[PDB]
Amino acid sequence: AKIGLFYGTQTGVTQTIAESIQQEFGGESIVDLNDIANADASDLNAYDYLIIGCPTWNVGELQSDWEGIYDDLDSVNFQGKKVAYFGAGDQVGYSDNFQDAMGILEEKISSLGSQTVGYWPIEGYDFNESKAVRNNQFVGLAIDEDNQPDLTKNRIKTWVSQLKSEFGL
C-alpha cells in the first residue's frame, strides 16, 4: 500500500472512522491502517501519501497518543508528501474548540513541507471557533458522532471519493 493512515483514539470513535475510510478506499491493499499508539514517528517516512486521524479532547487538546509523538514529528521528512486529515469532535459541547486537534496537527505537519489535500466545506455544521478552518473550509474531514451520527456515512464516502484523485487513484 502506498497510502498510510495513522489514527489515535480515546473512546474508539476515531478508530471506527479510520476503519471506514480504509474500506471506502478499497481495503487493506489500498491503505495501511495504523494506531499511532503503536508507531514511531519514523514510520511516517515510508509513505508519499498519509491520512492522519485525531479526535479533540479536553477543550482543544490532542488525543494522548498524538500528544506523545508530537515533538518527534520534526524528525520526519514531510517534504513532498501529500497529507489528508480527519477528526472526531463535538460541535455542541465544544463550540469554541471544534476539531482543534486536526488543526494543530495540520499546522505542524504542513510547516514541515507536506501539502495538505482534502479540504472539507463547513456547510451543515454549527460551531463558533476551530483551529482547523482555513479559507472557510475545514483542513480535513470533520466528523461529529456525538451530534451528527446520521451524516457520518455520507461524509466519509464523499470525502474519500474527492481524495482518490489526489492520491493518484
For residue 149, give the amino acid letter.
Answer: P
Residue with cell 521528512: 77
Per CB under 6 A, 10 contacts ligand FMN: yes
Element (H, E) at 53: strand 49-53
Contact map string, positions 93 to 112, toward ligand FMN, x by CB under 6 A: -x--xxxx------------
Taking the complex as a whole, how short is the minimal distance between the CB of residue 37 and ligand FMN, in angstroms? Answer: 12
Q: Which amino acid is at 129?
A: E
Considering only 25, 49, 57, 78, the residue that binds ligand FMN (CB under 6 A) is 57
* Minimum distance from residue 103 beta carbon to ligand FMN (Å): 10
Enumerate residues 6+ apart whose C-beta is below 8 A from 32: 1, 3, 4, 5, 47
Shortest separation between residue 146's beta carbon and ligand FMN, angstroms: 5
> Should residue 65 be labelled a site residue for ligand FMN when binding is judged by CB under 6 A?
no
95-133: b (≥16 Cβ within 10 Å) or e: eebbbbbbbbbbebbbeeebebbbbbeeeebebeebbbb
- In the bound state with ligand FMN, the residue whose beta carbon lies nearer, of 67 and 146, is 146
Residues 92, 96: Cα–Cα separation, whole Å: 9
Site string for ligand FMN, 15-54 (x = CB under 6 A): ----------------------------------------
Interface ranges with ligand FMN (CB under 6 A): 9-14, 55-60, 63, 88-90, 94, 97-100, 145-146
